[PDB]
Each structure stands twice: as structure tokens, then as C-alpha cells.
Design a protein around this nucleic acid. Structure first.
Ligand SMILES: OC[C@H]1O[C@@H](n2cnc3c(N[C@@H]4CCc5ccccc54)ncnc32)[C@H](O)[C@@H]1O
Ligand SMILES: [K+]
Ligand SMILES: [K+]
Length: 546
DNA sequence: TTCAAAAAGTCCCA
DNA sequence: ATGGGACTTTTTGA
């Protein structure tokens, strides 16, 4: 339940909020960690504060109560007035209390402002100058359902649907940050692009000035943790310019301890820096350099259609228990299943550019099983081996589905037709024409072209441009970066891809057909495909004027 | 009735 | 062991 932030990042975040604090003008800064754990951030805040007071102790002594400002009194003053922390874990607070106490070697006891509580429910009696830390990340599946009711009712401005718990910590931190205060936190990066984070992005943009965003993309910041990180620094200062510094990593393979400090890494060639006008952020935050922005805007202005305009999108089958319904095509159990019940089944790894690998699995479309007495053998010997787990699906407990039915079987006729399929998570654009009525789970998305757009766009033309290097770069500008070399390819962004028709349509389509013809050969010469792709990329770059 | 989003991913190996 | 790569289920709110 407790996660250790790397020391190099903790030091950076504390320095970010405190390095320019005028301790002479305000010797009572309130610094808060809203989920402080064992005190990774707060113990470093202590050290930074102690040097700050000690370096200026005589100036404080002269300006203020000279009996109060002595070096021997710095420890007590820091704990009474400056350091605040809250965490749900009682043991961690106890350890942090000891660590703060042991900063100096009984006299009258010193009150330490540490609270064991739910920070999202605490009645905070005052605002804070500086707020730092690493909040909990809990998504919609791992969050207890009784708690979501409170979040949906009290944090509705940032928390709906598939939002994350750390959205609410952003809201709490902002709300209790003083005027002129500064906050700096490390959270997942996904809210920067995700559909769920739209409301949170709106809340940040209109309530604070975002000073800086450090985007680590798919780098592994937390050892043995499958998460992708970013650092946000923001303030409530009266400013006029409100430009954001964006530091975006260039190589996801770096080990974070390259230098003694993080700011050395940010200035190095391992990162790129650029500025974004906060006032120009739409509901989407497009955080790219001027070359990429110029590139993105050209494509948007040139393309008159989007995929959503011309296509019908849908998510794949969700059986609710794949082991009950999915069998290898050579499994002897399939002799028990009438072939009218069997569908070809593919995984995301089966989707290549332009074409799908031949399927090795079969789906039992159990929705078409009329009743339990007529296909008893299928139920008793195949599906019923998982009857307990099948019965625990939500729609079976409510009686909407029979225990042997697919949870979300969708419409068969959507799959049993010519269509385009693509993996839900990939390192690159992989859009394939499906000729074989393939079904799939939710790791593969599909679409088909609307009837009224068939005479403007063909499937062969679409996989041509969509698989091109231009469109690979174009999609990744705004795509959701998930983990190292993985982007989400979900309809909420894939269907926003814009497309064009011009004089190059026929040659692009013809090149795509040549590629498809070679790829479907037995003795395929993969080499010529790459040359045809290079030729097609040139046509597309000519078409879009890049 | 029934859509689609969600990585403190998950699991394996050298 | 740890770090790094291949690959991706079904729960869930709306
Ligand atoms: O993971 C980083 C650190 O965050 C701490 N942490 C976790 N959840 C909280 C929290 N409220 C949450 C909101 C949802 C909920 C439900 C039940 C109980 C608590 C809470 N408030 C303060 N600290 C909290 C952990 O202990 C860890 O050291
Ligand atoms: K004085
Ligand atoms: K990562």
C-alpha cells in the first residue's frame, strides 16, 4: 500500500517548490504532503527548511523576536509551524513521527502536525503555502465500490465514469493551496491525454498556472511497477503570461540515476524542452514542439473527413470468461460443437499491417444455444467446467444472462463482414483488412465503412494511409502513451483520425493492393513490400504538403 | 438493453 | 534474484 519515490525525484520536487522561498519575508511556510507515507518528501522538506533558517538565523533574529530566532530553536519551530502530513496508514505516520523527532537529540514535548486520516474527507482548517508528494493511484476496478459513491458525489468535477482516485487528490491539493502557493506532485501521466481526464484537465487549467510538466512517457520510474509517470508543478500566483515548460523524455531506456540530480537530466540531450501557452489549451492538451505542431496542424486542415464521419466502430466480444468459450481449433472438444456455433477468434498479436494472421482459436458463440436440454453435451463438458466463475459475472447475478451465455456477445453480423481490425495496444499503426469474418475479444477493435462513403473510400485505400509512416507519427502526437513502446489504439482517439481524398487516391490504393497481394503470397518477398511502402509514404507526404 | 474505457498492467526468462 | 520484453481480461459506469 506504500510506494517509494526515487530520491532523485523527491529532491527535485521539494527543490521545485522551495528553492526561491523568501524565508525573511515569511518565516512560517506551511508545507504539506497529503499522502506522506513514511515521510519520503517531508523528511527532505525538513532538511531544506533547516538550512534555510540556519543560513538566515541572524537576519531573522534582527528583524523579529531575537529571543525566538536561535539555531537551537529551529527544530522546534519547523515542527510546530512548517511541516504537515496526512496518511491513512497509522503505522507509517508513527514511523514518520519518530523520524521527525530524531532529527535532533525530555523537555516540553513538541506537537507534530501529522494526521492519520482520509485526506479526501478531512476538514482542512487552513490552506497551505506548498504542497508536495505522491498520491495513491487506484483505478475503477481496484477501487472499492462503497468508496466510489462518495467520490462521484463530492468530487464530481474531476471524478466520473472510469476516472482514477488520483484525480481527486489533484482537486484536493489545488483547493487547499494558498493564493500564491506552489504545488508539485508525481502522478501517472495518463490524465494528460485520457478521455477520463478531460474534466480533471479542465479543473487544472482554469484554477492554477501550470509551471512545468516533466513527462517520462514509458520510462520505468518505479522499479517493478507497471505505471508511467509525470511531474506537475503549478501555482496560484497572479501572473500574466502563463506559459508551461514541458520537458519530454527522448529515450525511454534511460536509468534515472544518470546524474546526481534530476535537473541535470532535464537539461541534457536525453530530454527535449518546449513551451506551451496554457491559454491555447483546448479540452485536449497537445504538448508537442513547434515542428510537430506545424505537422499536426497541416494534416488537420488538409483532411476534410474523420474516420468517425465515414465508419462504424465497435469493440470486440467480451465473453466474461475466455477459458470457458475459447478453444484451440485442434481441440478434440470441438467435435461436440456444431460448426454453426463456431467462430474464428484472433488476438491482438495476430493483427499485422494490412492483413491478419490465420486464426488458431475458435469461439463458441453460446448465445445461439437455445436451451440446456438440447445441447447438453456442450454445456456439461465444455462451458460448465467454469460454471461457478461464469455465474459470478454481473449480468448473471442479476439474471440478464444465462450462466452459459457470453457476457457481451455484441452483434454477429458486425463481425461477419469485410472490415478493418487493429490491436487495442501497439507500438505502431497496425490496421488490417479482415477477409475471414474474424471475431475477437476487446484487445482488437474493428470498423467498417458506412454504405454512403463506399464510393469515396475503399478498405484498401484506408489501410494504405493508416499504416503509413505519416499516419503513424500523426496518430502518436495525441495518442495515449501507456508503457514502454505501447500506445492505446482505442476508438476514442482512433476515430478522430482525419483522412483525405485527392489526385493521389488511385496510386495510393493501387500500391496498397500490391502490398496486400504480396503479403498474402506463400513465398512472400517481404523486401518489395518495404519499397512499395516508401513510395506510398512519399505520395502521402506530397498529398499533405509535408 | 448494451455500449466502450481502464495499465501503481501481468507474466515470463535470463 | 531483478530488469526488461511479449503480450493483453473482464470489470465497470453510463
Ligand atoms: O500510496 C501513497 C500513499 O498514500 C496513502 N494513502 C492511500 N489512501 C489515502 C487517503 N485517502 C484514500 C482515498 C480513498 C480511500 C479509501 C479508504 C482509505 C483511504 C482512502 N488519504 C491519505 N493517504 C492515503 C498510502 O497509505 C500510501 O502511503
Ligand atoms: K530583533
Ligand atoms: K512504464
Amino acid at each position: 500500500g506504500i510506494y517509494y519515490t526515487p530520491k532523485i525525484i523527491v529532491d527535485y520536487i521539494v527543490k521545485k517548490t522551495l528553492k526561491n522561498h523568501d524565508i525573511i519575508k515569511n518565516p512560517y511556510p506551511r508545507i504539506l504532503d497529503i499522502s506522506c507515507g513514511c515521510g519520503n518528501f517531508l523528511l527532505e522538506v525538513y532538511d531544506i527548511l533547516y538550512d534555510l533558517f540556519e543560513e538566515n538565523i541572524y537576519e531573522l533574529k534582527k528583524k523579529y523576536d531575537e529571543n525566538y530566532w536561535t539555531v537551537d530553536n529551529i527544530h522546534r519551530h519547523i515542527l510546530n509551524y512548517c511541516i504537515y502530513g496526512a496518511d491513512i496508514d497509522e503505522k507509517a505516520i508513527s514511523i514518520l513521527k519518530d523520524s521527525l523527532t530524531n532529527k535532533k537529540v525530555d523537555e516540553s514535548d513538541i506537537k507534530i502536525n501529522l494526521f492519520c486520516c482520509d485526506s479526501l474527507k478531512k476538514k482542512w482548517r487552513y490552506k497551505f503555502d506548498y504542497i508536495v508528494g505522491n498520491p495513491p493511484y487506484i483505478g475503477h476496478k481496484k477501487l472499492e465500490k462503497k468508496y466510489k459513491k462518495f467520490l462521484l458525489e463530492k468530487y464530481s468535477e474531476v471524478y466520473k465514469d472510469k476516472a482514477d482516485l488520483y484525480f481527486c487528490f489533484y482537486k484536493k491539493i489545488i483547493d487547499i493551496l494558498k493564493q500564491g502557493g506552489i504545488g508539485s506532485v508525481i502522478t501517472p501521466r495518463y490524465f494528460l491525454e485520457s478521455l477520463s481526464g478531460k474534466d480533471l484537465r479542465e479543473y487544472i487549467k482554469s484554477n492554477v498556472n501550470v509551471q512545468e510538466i516533466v513527462d517520462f512517457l514509458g520510462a520505468n520510474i518505479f522499479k517493478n511497477i507497471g505505471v508511467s509517470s509525470c511531474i506537475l508543478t503549478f501555482d496560484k500566483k497572479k501572473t500574466k503570461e502563463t506559459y508551461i515548460d514541458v520537458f519530454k523524455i527522448k529515450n525511454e531506456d534511460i536509468c534515472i540515476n544518470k546524474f546526481e540530480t534530476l535537473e541535470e537530466l532535464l537539461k541534457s540531450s536525453k530530454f527535449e524542452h518546449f513551451n506551451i501557452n496554457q491559454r491555447l489549451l483546448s479540452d485536449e492538451w497537445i504538448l508537442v514542439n513547434k515542428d510537430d505542431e506545424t505537422f499536426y496542424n497541416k494534416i488537420q486542415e488538409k483532411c476534410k473527413y474523420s474516420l468517425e464521419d465515414i465508419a462504424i466502430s465497435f469493440q470486440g466480444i467480451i465473453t466474461g470468461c475466455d477459458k470457458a468459450f475459447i478453444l484451440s481449433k485442434d481441440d478434440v472438444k470441438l467435435n461436440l460443437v456444431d460448426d454453426k456455433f463456431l467462430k474464428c477468434w484472433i488476438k491482438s498479436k495476430n493483427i499485422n499491417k494490412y492483413i491478419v494472421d490465420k486464426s488458431e482459436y475458435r469461439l463458441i458463440y453460446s448465445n445461439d444455444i437455445d436451451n440446456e436440454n438440447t445441447n447438453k453435451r456442450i454445456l456439461d463438458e465444455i462451458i460448465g467446467l467454469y460454471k461457478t466463475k461464469l455465474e459470478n459475472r454481473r449480468e448473471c447475478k442479476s439474471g440478464i444472462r444465462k450462466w452459459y451465455e457470453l457476457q457481451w456477445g455484441r452483434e454477429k453480423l458486425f463481425f461477419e463482414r469485410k472490415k478493418i481490425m487493429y490491436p487495442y495496444k501497439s507500438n505502431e499503426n497496425r490496421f488490417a483488412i479482415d477477409y475471414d469474418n474474424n471475431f475477437s475479444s476487446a484487445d482488437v477493435y474493428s470498423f467498417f465503412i458506412k454504405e454512403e462513403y463506399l464510393d469515396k473510400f475503399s478498405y484498401e485505400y484506408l489501410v494504405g494511409i493508416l499504416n503509413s509512416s505519416v499516419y503513424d507519427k500523426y496518430f502518436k502526437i495525441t495518442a495515449k502513451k501507456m508503457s514502454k513502446n505501447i500506445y492505446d489504439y482505442y476508438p476514442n482517439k482512433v476515430m478522430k483520425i482525419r483522412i483525405f481524398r485527392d489526385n493521389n487516391y488511385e496510386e495510393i490504393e493501387n500500391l496498397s493492393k500490391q502490398i496486400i497481394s504480396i503479403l498474402l503470397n506463400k513465398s512472400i518477398d517481404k523486401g518489395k513490400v518495404e519499397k512499395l511502402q516508401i513510395k506510398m509514404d512519399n505520395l502521402i507526404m506530397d498529398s499533405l504538403g509535408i
